[PDB]
């Protein structure tokens, strides 16, 4: 909860992110984009403590078990590399290592949820400083989680066709009454305002991507979206930290 | 399994199809159809020991209530009702009572199980003497299910989203091999020839209606269709059932 | 002012209205226990006879309603004159204005209207209705209508109740409604006025039914006096609208 | 009566207090966002007239930051990358007054009904073209004078047509005008311009970096100003439009 | 007759096959592992020069495939007089029919082809195909369409090999299929002829993918002599390819 996830392709930005506050980070290097050299991921491993991810592209199931082997803690099934199956995502119910998926709205995180997804995330426009789709899938999500929080019992079915989600995973929902997984802010996210806001419209972290660390001061940077994401009412600190 | 249920107005058309060999009957009487006056269910109920059925308007949550209230063994949520709801179905899950639901498709048998349906039946078109739609449906519906316990695990979920299914219910029929409910035909169904063929078909079982009745000998047409569903592939025997 | 109107109408929950066309049919309507009477008579349906109306509110005690045509404010004054308990601005009579309902807000006499959805019946509480119905499809003995209306517009009642108070202005420019009035029933919990079913109501389980989904009563037409007893039969309606989780008791008022 | 002006910097602000604005609009000059507040204080401690910033549409947080700054008025402002496409932000829920853009009384009674105190045209700014500043003035002032003037009992339907809150048309109706001020706004660059768009109803003008990369950016701003306020004295507007 | 040629390459499955353009290649290709090569050489691409053929088979001892133009009767007679081992009627070259394929039942020396879907499998069989390969989208490094083909020509097998038999026909005017064919799929349970991947194949993980998709091998091109340490390279894969599912071995090999 309540966290930060950072980018990172090497140890020094890697320590950089665990002396910053980032829960945990995400190994990366950098045509056709692929799961990254295990020497990197094994080099970010090493430099520091919190939980390490990577990733992997979307379907490949062998590039996941690598990654399972190599002793990774979170797996990201992410549309940002390119796709490698076009029709089928991982089953990741048989891995014993957890994944993170993006979605854009109930339907897709439903499906996510279905095929194993323990963690969600906001698909965005990553790269692009935008947060503008982040918080439309954000606002997508959470009001059809309302709806289908508030709905009569016996419409659900109907809902779940609409959406083309598993009736299950709505049952659970109205059950609980929030999405049975965590759900990140991902894409855009550039100021501490971003990462405030993400945290206002029902995010429950965020992730942040290579920006940080072509800033001039990286660690001051990732301090100040850190604490803006843990302090995210407190408006008097946030004006303070977007000063830099 | 194996059987035949047959549409009765009264205790008298109640007896010959008991005595037929019928494994159910079902109540009915005969603009706006809707649930049938209770006199004419009781009517039957006590003119017979094998159970009896009847059914309501899609939709039509008290009428529903009204029939398990009666006592009756088996309520069908029927099409050939003018529905009450052309949105949601009856939560039949919250009853005690076991439903009979007709479906068209894999897609729509799914939905009606995650309703709570004890039971299936082809939709067919009733009173047509045509036994073309129920063949379709039950045709439709045993080449999805072929499919789907034949499949790669890793695309139920995306077979449920283009079949509109939940994937719970795919995932009980891939590792049951069948649908977990019976699937009876139902609409058309007027020779002896016609019920073997649906077994042939992978029916578990026909639904025949007042058809028997308008007939000249309803006990000996009764009992060719019964015998005719039990034994469909004694050629020889239905050659002689069909000299009527 | 609005709050006396409402206050009337909140005293009229749990019940069934009946439409009657002379003083037998009214009385019988009361002595089966309708907690009101709406007073009726192709082709051209206008306003009744002020004959007719006198005749069932001197026929009864409990209140009478009328209704009029659709945009129709002189024949509302009208009834509004005869001193009608309430009106019914009703699209079962030839609607007299296609674009613009009755500003009901200048009338002493509480209004009912028919809604569809959400949208609508915003609209008419803004014009100043005091108490809502359901569209239907009269006349057809087929309740599938009613029953589309009632669950639309409580379905966007749920959504409304619940949804994030900023995306509200958004959700009034999609449901064209006026958003003082989603206001308003985000903050109740529900509608600001009473919603009945109407349109095709039947059978004992029709109305208990359609409390079930929702609704805060019944209207029934015609078809009462038709039937052999109607005195029983509306009084089935009545029993199973107020008792409609009973199901042993809607079960034998059904044999009739 | 007012005139608006947007400045950079310390330098700037005085110039345009100097000259008559009523008010000053801080800004910065990819992805537009709220300024950096090092930016809005320093500008906010230059002058004595309310200060405005801003901030993107949708942005609850950044205008949230600039409530705490102690700025005067926040402009939610389309010149800014939007951060919602859908949604803007709740402004009942803050202290702060906003300031909004509309193109017509449908948006202007959104707008109104989400809680905006200050009404100001879309334009097209930067462009030096008054066009379109035009089109949304004569478009919001003529629906204001059809709803003033209109048959009460046809407001709900209208309200329909226009997508407006009917409570917003029924104000409007029983005051005559627009609850709140609305400005002109985008591309509004000679001193006829800016009395032009009195002359068609604005209550005020809002105007742009054009009047620093002037040669006498003092006297430009006085020009405007004077021109804004006398909007009639056509000998005098002529007097200005000279330098 | 056809069984010969058959049974030549299913002795191929688990196996690597590589691109190599002359006689050093070809030998690296060999020494790494390889069950097989393709001897090859925008604008138009036609038949390899036998000069570069007759290179590559004189380098090595494993099979030599080359690749022909579609269509292209002439230049697959000629490699067949060559003596190459195997022809890879190919896309990759430029048709030189683009409505008719060579009637490979002809031919003494066995035929590989594309395919995207069972339909087009089925026909590359009816016209004499002895091995089939997935058509994928070869330079690009992408998995993908590779991907696509493997599952969509699986699923319809798993779909045929499941289906009731009096299906079969409709099935097989769907698919544009030769019926004869779908039916021994059927009794079979799978392809008669050997399947294999091709098009992107790039990493080790991507090589034991399309195992683990149901390839019965992969065709790798010329990314792999472009590396730093080809050997090594190529190696990699033909080790990933063989033991698909040791996930431990896959992780060390990929370093390199």
Same mark, same amino acid.
């Given at each position: 909860?309540?966290?930060?996830?950072?980018?990172? +392709?090497?140890?020094?930005?890697?320590?950089?992110?665990?002396?910053?506050?980032? +829960?945990?980070?995400?190994?990366?290097?950098?045509?056709?984009?692929?799961?990254?050299?295990?020497?990197?991921?094994?080099?970010?491993?090493?430099?520091?403590?919190?939980?390490?991810?990577?990733?992997?592209?979307?379907?490949?199931?062998?590039?996941?078990?690598?990654?399972?082997?190599?002793?990774?803690?979170?797996?990201?099934?992410?549309?940002?590399?390119?796709?490698?199956?076009?029709?089928?995502?991982?089953?990741?119910?048989?891995?014993?290592?957890?994944?993170?998926?993006?979605?854009?709205?109930?339907?897709?995180?439903?499906?996510?949820?279905?095929?194993?997804?323990?963690?969600?995330?906001?698909?965005?426009?990553?790269?692009?400083?935008?947060?503008?789709?982040?918080?439309?899938?954000?606002?997508?999500?959470?009001?059809?989680?309302?709806?289908?929080?508030?709905?009569?019992?016996?419409?659900? +079915?109907?809902?779940?066709?609409?959406?083309?989600?598993?009736?299950?995973?709505?049952?659970? *929902?109205?059950?609980?009454?929030?999405?049975?997984?965590?759900?990140?802010?991902?894409?855009?996210?550039?100021?501490?305002?971003?990462?405030?806001?993400?945290?206002?419209?029902?995010?429950?972290?965020?992730?942040?991507?290579?920006?940080?660390?072509?800033?001039?001061?990286?660690?001051?940077?990732?301090?100040? *979206?850190?604490?803006?994401?843990?302090?995210?009412?407190?408006?008097?600190?946030?004006?303070?930290?977007?000063?830099?």
């Amino acid at each position: 909860k309540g966290g930060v996830i950072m980018d990172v +392709v090497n140890a020094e930005q890697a320590k950089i992110a665990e002396a910053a506050g980032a +829960v945990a980070v995400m190994a990366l290097e950098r045509g056709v984009a692929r799961m990254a050299d295990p020497t990197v991921i094994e080099e970010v491993m090493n430099a520091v403590s919190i939980p390490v991810m990577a990733k992997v592209r979307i379907g490949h199931y062998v590039e996941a078990r690598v990654l399972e082997a190599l002793g990774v803690d979170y797996i990201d099934e992410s549309e940002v590399l390119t796709p490698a199956d076009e029709e089928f995502h991982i089953d990741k119910r048989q891995f014993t290592v957890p994944f993170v998926c993006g979605c854009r709205d109930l339907g897709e995180a439903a499906r996510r949820i279905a095929e194993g997804a323990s963690m969600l995330r906001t698909k965005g426009e990553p790269g692009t400083g935008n947060i503008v789709e982040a918080v439309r899938h954000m606002r997508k999500v959470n009001a059809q989680i309302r709806k289908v929080v508030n709905m009569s019992e016996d419409e659900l +079915v109907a809902e779940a066709k609409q959406l083309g989600a598993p009736v299950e995973v709505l049952r659970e *929902i109205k059950r609980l009454g929030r999405l049975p997984v965590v759900n990140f802010a991902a894409g855009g996210v550039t100021t501490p305002a971003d990462a405030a806001l993400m945290m206002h419209l029902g995010a429950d972290g965020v992730f942040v991507g290579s920006g940080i660390f072509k800033s001039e001061n990286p660690e001051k940077y990732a301090r100040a *979206i850190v604490e803006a994401t843990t302090h995210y009412e407190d408006y008097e600190l946030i004006a303070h930290l977007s000063k830099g």
